[PDB]
Write a protein that binds this ligand. Structure first.
Ligand code: NI
Lengths: 147, 148, 153, 148
């Protein structure tokens, strides 16, 4: 029964280790009491203090033992990436989506923002006519914009 | 009844023209119709074709008889003035506010933003710890952020 | 690839059968295109000719060939239950929550109601003080309460 | 400057008095502070200590000198009068209106509620086959449901 995180694979870790991942959808990282069957059949429960608020993230270690580990993996989803030309054009998108109540994440870079696919968020984005694309990928809860 | 934009005395206009405007509070800027009595107690009503979708801007030139101008003044209001420290910070603000369903205006510099004062909001802005000042101020219908 | 329902188990079916439930979370019952894994091996896609409007329900028969059945189990989750004293009160909750854009479901009797636990939704429910216990419980689609989308459909 | 809700009229008091009325719409009762022109000529100096949440109700007695009084008349407005046939349906309605962040008031009959008139809100009410009827009427902020 897991209680606290031993950090992240990201912070090396050249692996090197055996890793059992725990495969979680994006909408599932804030779960607090939970039971899980791991990637390799294994069992693992979670009951956390100072649960990372924003959510659990890519490669979060639930369990390290010698060279054995369990990390969180975060399953890829359908996703609208967004490219604002300008700092104004950012504010505009963001308020807009806010107003919509959609979810919203930072991109890999400056004027990039990903939010889940939804046919009407598309809609919006075309209306105001912005640079988007749908790409199966990864919305780390670390990237989110507070509820 | 009055009908046409002839613009906005931003195109100075160091007057040259004795001025008499109507006073709308900032949201009353999108009546498709209504009547009021101007600031020097004169009369005229409204009708609306093609009046810019965002609302009436500051100094929207209504009437003209020689030099004697009838137009629009937007009263100043209590206003939260936000200074973002980074493009990230902006986005947060906007999403967060736009979600609140509150209303937003672009500011003076790239990173400045203006919304009506409320407590819920001010509050919020401090539970995110952005720097801002509460000021009394005009809100051009033109620097509003749209919604759709 | 599955097309439409074959009724429910409420229509017994005193099983007497081998149900292989597919396991839905509360908000998953309304997709019409999605790929599943039954409780045991089987792969299962759904493409739904005339989906029920409010969603899939408890043990709706997704697949009925011979004895071999595959029905919908709906997972449990933390529900704020709500028992509320009068028609006035009801009317508040509901309004206050619709504004919150939260999910909301008719409970067992005329006065009770269920909603997904979040913290805000609860925090207020005390802040205005209606009777409510939080319970691991099932949220039946059949018993929703339209939707929304928030603001304009 | 007025503070005092000197009281409210319906505590008879059956005039008894000359009473000058000042006429606001429902949307205008909200403020602690701002200014005005009365039925017969005049103009109001005020702020509000205990601005009863809700706001300025009907004939909340503002100023009072002899049989010389002013107080709040509130104008009629189109209103949607709703008759929910059961609590099942009370809930579906309330919720679905709150979901529009629209406005809503307790009724008079038992499964009656009232909300401003808006062409989409209407649109709503018929989709559900809830039965209503649009009437010009009063709106007591003593009757608006809250949102916290
Ligand atoms: Ni909303």
């Amino acid at each position: 029964i897991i209680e606290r995180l031993v950090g992240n694979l990201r912070d090396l870790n050249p692996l090197d280790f055996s890793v059992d991942h725990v495969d979680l959808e994006w909408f599932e990282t804030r779960k607090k009491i939970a039971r899980f069957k791991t990637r390799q059949g294994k069992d693992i429960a979670i009951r956390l203090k100072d649960a990372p608020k924003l959510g659990l993230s890519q490669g979060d270690i639930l369990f390290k033992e010698e060279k054995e580990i369990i990390a969180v993996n975060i399953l890829d989803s359908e996703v609208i990436h967004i490219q604002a030309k300008s700092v104004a054009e950012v504010a505009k998108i963001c308020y807009e989506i806010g107003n919509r109540h959609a979810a919203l994440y930072y991109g890999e870079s400056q004027f990039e923002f990903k939010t889940p696919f939804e046919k009407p968020t598309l809609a919006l984005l075309e209306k105001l006519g912005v640079q988007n694309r749908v790409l199966s990928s990864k919305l780390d809860s670390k990237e989110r914009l507070t509820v």
